[PDB]
């Protein structure tokens, strides 16, 4: 699922799945 | 940023993990 | 959508919708 | 944290916006 174009909710979803209980930051601009 | 590297171009696990806490 | 229990992808989704182009941080532990 | 306030209990917009950049 990660090695593709990922935009908006699709990108946030990938971060959530990959990062797990570490969480993440989403900084689009 | 993340949009340029993963939306506008093909994402990678190596880049996504850079945004994990 | 925000004034309910929100867990896991549901919570990340709410943050994405509310925060818009500011983005957000998700720090579950 | 956010899990305690929005998963384990009822979330709010006032609390969610505290996590926006």
From Swiss-Prot, chains B, D:
It comes from the Eukaryota. Disulfide bonds join 6-11. This is Insulin A chain. It comes from Bos taurus (Bovine). The lineage of its organism: Eukaryota, Metazoa, Chordata, Craniata, Vertebrata.
């Amino acid at each position: 699922f990660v090695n593709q174009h990922l935009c908006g909710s699709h990108l946030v979803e990938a971060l959530y799945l990959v990062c797990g209980e570490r969480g993440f930051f989403y900084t689009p601009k | 940023g993340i949009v340029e590297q993963c939306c506008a171009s093909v994402c990678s696990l190596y880049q996504l993990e850079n945004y994990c806490n």
